[PDB]
Structure formats: C-alpha cells, structure tokens
Symmetry: D2
Amino acid sequence: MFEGSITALVTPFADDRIDEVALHDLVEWQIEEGSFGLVPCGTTGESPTLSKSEHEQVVEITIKTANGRVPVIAGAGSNSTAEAIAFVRHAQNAGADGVLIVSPYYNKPTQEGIYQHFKAIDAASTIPIIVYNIPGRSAIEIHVETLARIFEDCPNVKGVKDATGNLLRPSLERMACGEDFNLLTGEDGTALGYMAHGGHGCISVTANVAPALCADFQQACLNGDFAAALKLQDRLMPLHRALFLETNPAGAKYALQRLGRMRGDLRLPLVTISPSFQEEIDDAMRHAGILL
Amino acid sequence: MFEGSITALVTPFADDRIDEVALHDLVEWQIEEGSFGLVPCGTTGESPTLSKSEHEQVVEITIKTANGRVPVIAGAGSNSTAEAIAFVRHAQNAGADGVLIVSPYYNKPTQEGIYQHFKAIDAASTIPIIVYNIPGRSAIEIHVETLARIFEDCPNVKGVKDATGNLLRPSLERMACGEDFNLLTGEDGTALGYMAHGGHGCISVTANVAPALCADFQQACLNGDFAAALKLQDRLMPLHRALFLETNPAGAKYALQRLGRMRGDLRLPLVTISPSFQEEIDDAMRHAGILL
Amino acid sequence: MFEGSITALVTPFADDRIDEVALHDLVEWQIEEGSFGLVPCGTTGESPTLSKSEHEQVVEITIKTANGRVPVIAGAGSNSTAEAIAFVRHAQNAGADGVLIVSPYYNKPTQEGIYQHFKAIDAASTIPIIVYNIPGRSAIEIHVETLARIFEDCPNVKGVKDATGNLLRPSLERMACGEDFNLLTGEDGTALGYMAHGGHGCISVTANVAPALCADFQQACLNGDFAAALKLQDRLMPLHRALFLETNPAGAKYALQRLGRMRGDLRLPLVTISPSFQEEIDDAMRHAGILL
Amino acid sequence: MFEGSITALVTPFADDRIDEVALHDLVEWQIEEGSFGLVPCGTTGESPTLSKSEHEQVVEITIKTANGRVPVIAGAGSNSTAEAIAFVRHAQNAGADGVLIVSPYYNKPTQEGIYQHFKAIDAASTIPIIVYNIPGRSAIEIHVETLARIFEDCPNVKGVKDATGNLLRPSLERMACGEDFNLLTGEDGTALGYMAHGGHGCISVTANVAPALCADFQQACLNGDFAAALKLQDRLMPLHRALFLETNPAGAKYALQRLGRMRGDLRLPLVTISPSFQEEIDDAMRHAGILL
C-alpha cells in the first residue's frame, strides 16, 4: 500500500508555459526532503487549467525525475468517464505507479453512475486506482457502500483519498472494506486524527512547502508515536490553515515562490492570494522554521 | 434581451456518436412548437461528456437548423478561463447569438477570480454573455455585488441564468443591476415565482419534452396573466417534478425516448433513470396531456 | 382560510418586561393599517426568550386588542410535544383563531416523530393548525409526503408557513395536498414568487414596519395583479433585504424603535443590529417612503 | 481538566415520570464500569422534553448517586440566556462540578450575541463551563475567534464539547486557546482522531451502553496507546454507527432496554428506533461483546 506524506505537486508556470526546470527541481527537492510519494496533476497541481499536452508533460517530467525512487500517482480524473480512461491509459503507459480519480464533478452522477464510472476506468487500467472523494468540490458524494462495492468489484481500485472532513469515514470504511483498504487523507489539518483512525498516509498540500516536517509528522504517525505527531501538528498548524486562507493552491504557490523555488503564476479563474494573507503565510512558515 | 421558454437542448446520441438526424428534428420541432430560443451544449446537453469536436458540431447544427428563427445561446463555460474563451470564440464565429457561461466549477475560485474569469471572456467576446450561477453543481457562489460588478465592467455581459433556488436573487439583482439586467431562471419548477419577481424567461429542461406547453406558460407570465400561468403549473408540475427524480438530463432523455424523438443513450458517469421513475415520468406526461 | 399580510408581531420590551402599552398600540396601528391577521409570539416575537407567563400575556393582549377584527394565530410551537399541547390549549382557551406550530427544533426527530408530534397536538386542539416548516432554524425538514400525511390524518391541520426558500414546495404541496391546503410564506423577500405559485399569503416580518405597503402588496397578489405587486417589490425589497442584515428580529425592532413605536430592547442571546446596518434600514425605509 | 469517557446520560422514563431507580442504577453501574464522568440532562438525556422540575431531579439524583466519585457536569443550556443562568444556578447549588452550555439553538444569535450569552452565564456561575458547539442541531456556529474571546474573557469557561465534525477545530483551538483549553469531543465515532489532535476526552453516547470498553478506549488514548485504541475502535465502530441509525438517544435507549437496564420509553417528538435498526444494534453489541 501507499503511505506517509504523498505530495500533491503544485504545477509551476512560467511565461504561460509549464516551468520544466522549476518542476524538476520541485520533484528532486521533494524527494531529498523525505516525501514518500508524488501526485502530479492533482487539484493542487491545477489540473483544471492544464491542457491535455501539459498534463502529459507534467506526469512524464514527474515520472522521469522521480526515477522510481518513490511512487508516482498521476491525477487522471474527469467528470467524463471516457476522458478519465484516456488519462489513465497515458499514466500507466508513462510508467506511473497509480492514478488518482476524483468523483465526477459538476454533472452529479447517481451512485450507480459513480459505480459504473470506476468500473469502466478499472477495466482500462493496469495500475492502482485511488478514489478521490471530495464532496466539497465535486458537489456529489460517494457513499460508503458504493465505495465498498467499487473496491470489491474492481481489482485495481486499492483505496481512497478522503477529503470529506467526516472522520467516521476511515472507521466506517475499515468496516465495509477490510484493513487491506488503502486509507489516504486529502486534508492536512486533520491528518493527525485520520491516522489515529487507521489511516495510511496523506496526499498533501502542505508537503509542497514543508516536505521534511510533513515527512517526520507522517513517519511519527506510522511509528504510532502520536505524542511527537502532536508536537509536529503544533508546529505545522499555522501553515495548514494559512495555506488554505483563500483557495488552494494559491497559498502553496505564494509560499513556494516566497522560497525562491518557482514563479507564483496561477491560471485563471484562480488568482494570487490576498496580500494580508501573504503575511500570515510568511509568519506561518517562520513559525514552522521554514522561513528565516 | 432574451425571454420566454429557451430550451436547454438535450444532446441525442446513437452508437456513441451525436445523433445528427435526431438533433436536427429536435431543434426543428422545438421551433415549430413555439420555443423562444435554444441553448445547445448546456449542462442538459451533457456538455461535460462532449468532445470538443462534438461540442462544435452540436452548436453548428443547432444554429444552421434554427436559421435565425429563434436566438441560439451556445453553452461555452469551463472551469478554465482559457478554455471558455475558446468556446466563445468558436460560438460567435459560428453565428451564435450569445453564450451561456457557467461559474467555474470544482476549482472554487474566489470572487475576484470569478470576476477576472468573466472579464477575460468579455474581452474575447463580440456576442452577449449570460452568467450561469448554479452553486449546487459548481460548489461556488457568485455574490450579488460580484455579479453587479461584472455586469458593470463587462459590456457583453447582459444577464444571468439563476439556478440558486433563492428567490430573493432576482429582486436583489433588480436593485444592484438595473431592470435592464436580463433575468432568466435555470429551474423549471420555480419559474412561476421567478417571473413574478421580474424574471424575463427560463432556460428550460422541461421545454425539451413539452415545448408547446412551456412556451405558453412563459407567454402567460410575460403577459402578466399569472392566473393562466398557475393553471399551467398545475398541468406541468408533475412533469417538472418527475424530470428531476434523478440527475438531469437522465429524466428528459427517457421522456424524449418514450416519445420516440431519440434514443435514451446517456454517457457515463450518467446512467439511465430508475424504472419506477420512468413510470412517474410516463404518468406526468399523460397528466400534461403529452402522452395518451 | 388565512390570507394576505399576516404580521408576525415583534414583542416590545421595556425594563426587562413586556411593554404592554407599546404592544397594544402596535396591534391597533397594525389593524388600522390594513394587516390581514396577527401572529403573536412567533419567532419574530422572540418566543424563545419569553417566560410562559409572558407568552400568555402577549397572546391575550393581542386577542383582546384585535377584538375579532382580524384573525389572531398564536405561536404555540415547541420541541416538546407536551409543551406544544400546553401552548395550544391556552391559546384556544384565550380565543385564538388558530396556532402556528413550528417543526421540533434542535432535537431532530425522524419524520414519523414529527408526524406523531402534530397528531398529538391535533388531538388536543379545537382550532386551526398551521405547520411552520423552517429547516434553517430547526435543523430538520418536513418532507412533502409527511406534510401531506399530517394534513390528511389531522382535521385541525389546515396549512403551512413555508420558510424553506424552495419554491417547488407550494407547487408540490398543491399536488400532494389539494388546493384546499392553506399556503403561507415565512419569507417576505420571496412572497411575490410564492403567490405566483399559488400561495395564499405571508406571515410577515416586514409587515411590522410597513403594515400598509405589505397589505397592499398582498392584495395585489391576491387580485392576480402581479404587475402592481412587482412595482411594490421594487419599493419594499431594500427593506426586505435590510431587515435581515443580521438575525431577525434585530432589524425590525431597530426600525420600529427608529419610528418611535417601541424601544429597541432585545433579549440575550440576541443583540442590537450593527450600526452600519441601522443606516441601511434607515435608507430602506426612506426608499419605501416610510421615513422622510 | 476533565478527561476520558464522560457519559452523556440517557434519562430513563417510566409511567411518564423520571425512572428514579433505573437512573440511580444507571449511574452506579456507569461508575463501577469505569466512566470518568457523567453529564446528566444533555441532549442524549432528552433535556428538551424534560420539565424544569424533572431536569432538577435528574441533576440532583445524579449528583447524590455519584457522591463525588466522578465529576458531574450538568447540562444547563438554553436558547434563552436568562434560563441558562437559572439552570446553572441550580446546578452549582446542587453540588455540580460543572455545566454544559450549548450554543443558542433555533434563534440563531450573531457571534456577538453568542459572546454576550456566555459572558452573562459566566458571571452568574461559580463552576466550570464547557461550551457545547454543535452547529448540526443549533443551526448556528461558534467561530474559533469567538470561542477564543469567550475563553479569555470568562474565567469560568474552561473548554468545549466539540460536535462540529471538523477535525481542524481541536488543532485551531489549540492555537487560539492554549493547551490549558479543555478539549472534549461530542462525537464517539471520531473520538479516536480527536484524541490524536490533542483531545482530552469525550462526552459520550456509546458509553451509555458500553461504559467499560469506552473507558478502556479513552484510557488507551490518554496513555498515548493509539494502536490499542484502534483495536478498540475496531470493536466499537458497529455500535457507534448503529447507535445513530436514526436519532439519538433512540438507539441508546433501545440498547439499554435490550440489556434490561431501563424501559425504552422516549418522549415525543422522538419515537422508538425502527425494528430493522434494533437488529443492527443487537449485532453491534454482540460484536462488541456486550450482548451474548
């Protein structure tokens, strides 16, 4: 199974193009810093504003740079089943260790619809699928029973990236699906409590800016050392909330730009985080020890 | 100014391709039945599962078939501002009378980002822009001030397709945006109250199956004859209700298939409406006198 | 049948006691201004902070002052069925024309529990019962079937005070519950659309400050003259909007205090409306011609 | 500070009266089983359907039976500030170790309102106050800053009973309020993750039926032994969800009645849990080892 701090990579842009060098450097630093894995082209990587070819470039750059040192789980979802499949076919042919498929957004399929969506994607897949359940953005939910049915009927579906904010979920999924079900969290601020519930790791936003600390936090939870994990939460909380002041990845890109690791370029409809929030992010990093 | 019953056309499929003959006969029948305008490739037209080439063919076939008889407002939204500009450019170049731009879905942009979204689109447009405010699918809202500011700074933005279900909106918008603001409803079952609050029409789902009755309903509303509009509500409510028993357009396609105007084919993640719901739709059409 | 502008009376306080002189003059002025009916001790009458003895005095003073000129529908709800029966018994024994029973709040009963709630109250009643469906405060809903079932099995249940903000409701209720079902709105800003969908009136908050204009609005609606009703909306919307800038009845009490009809005294946990909002209310009253 | 498994006592009824003997026995068994504390007259104890005198009897019976062996935190909230104070004055004069004050429900006070509510209650209090934040029932929220302001300005306010379902809360409160802030959870199913976040205990529903296991679970979390806690969660999850199948305390009373510890009598508008759910609760207890 996948575990620990798995970074949901921000996608650096420069001159309206993918910043190849900044991305390679981001991935390398991410690995030498301790990340257990990478997720290129997720929501944090601004997948919605990426072109088909850019998405492919980012997945491939990430796969070639990681060079098998850590798992690479390519974001390959869509609210169109046929397109999710095209993305999944590219990911696996590119050497990806797995894919992250979000629940169809906007068109609000029924549970049977969501079921058939993943069954079709599972069929065209040859790698691990992690179901990305985030009702807050997709405007639809994946019921525990539906999730359980998908896990049971789709050999490639191995787990979930839970972003419901409902902590009964990891426990209810441990019941519906066994202990062999891969439980990953999609939200940093509550990863502490998610791990206590039997979670395996977190596809992280904060790890983009504080990779080493997030790695230690995760490793601390994996070692069952929740006291250390708490102290780490104490150090990382200001950043966890500051990174979400407005809409992610606006804060993560400001943070990484403030660190001189990329330009802070965001693509419309997203815009640069508000200035007062930029200060809060600064003090948040100073508090974590990231910013001098 | 757009008004009356503007049909949000369902996109007929056959053998995994656009059913062009069915699409043509739908637009035609729709026009001879009295519809005030057509909206090809909206959410009811399953735009999310349409290839970019299919999107274009559907818009063009509708425009060519309409032959200037009724306005054609092309769906051209996207959660990528760059992509939205591409749909708008194509549409206006194809002869569309305007465009339906939904608020960016899933990526949850701030209010300033939404404002910049529409300002960037307005700069690339040469045709009327209607803002599709539907929080329940986009997982984001467009505050009245934001909407008023967009109307003020964007010369091509002429109105809204309100799908909030909050009837204070048209009143609040009449205040913030003058009476020259084009008010259209996105929901059939509450169009009656919307028109009473000063609405100008409705971009309809029900108009797909009962074009004649809906057009009359709107005409009553427009003539201020709300007594007749209510009588029509009594006749259409069962259908308005049944068409939404599961996620739209599953219900409308079942109905048009039952009426023999196309195949009920839907694309994943969407699935055919449940059988007990098919019966309710049958009874609603019989009640509306659409079926014998 | 209840109809028109039924004022949900604010409860005037002075020196931590009911201001009886102010209450009497409010009911009187309200009646000579044209209000169709009065609802003492509703949520706008701060029933939650009223002692049981104060509740009774307010109901009785309103009834005595009304002197049979307009119907008096007494607030008698509670999240305790036993307590609701006590309020209803007192009310009818005091000469109330009916009772306003809110859905049980906070304790979130199932639909069967709500049904039994109203069935137990209907058995103790001898006067008309109106069901106050307001999900936003009660944190619970009354499905249409449940509401229809209550209407069917409870001879004293005559209608609803809809405060869902879902305009499909009156239409769906017209279907499930015949046209003999008394439809009243709980929200002023959407009364216009409610009446167009077949509503019979509105249990108003705005009618407290502009009894004359609201009564006219309702009369227009009732006469099917929606053109005039819209014109009145234009005149009342600013006020409908300002009266709800913060939690009601904070806005209405500020307005009636500014008009010199009572003290602005509110009981904790409720506090006086913010100063910038007081100004917006002032401007709204000036716009509605209520203030010079 | 308060910690561990603090039971939110169900209130046994018999012949429409408080079942004095069943309650005494419940409290004794609760103590000999390992409970770290008792909360008489909370939501689980059906405070909404209790009379002023019954509430007082239950608090006093609980205080006399506990006989100082464990803390007794009397539920003393209301959406009326004056009444919360009356309840708090009785609790402390009765020998209570603290009180549980819910955020005002139904009347939706503003944050300043909620602030003044607790400031007034704090003033009339001489014992610890735990703020019960449960937006799901109260239909209002207590912002972190508001909570922090209340903690800082009210010497008697020592902590919170968090029932938001938002795990960022314990971490954000650890930041706003220090480590001296008493963090108690209001929801059993996510207590595991709450403790990982620095939680001190849980005012429990499940502890009513499985007091010893909930005690061990809590003690396990207090000892920082999250591996054991997980195994305990594994054993207790079926009961945690089964106890909330319908509306609490309907399942808790069925469970305790199934154990022969009281009659399952519930007060309207609440009703007995559905039969199929009674079976699920049975198997849930058999799974936990409670039921033979």
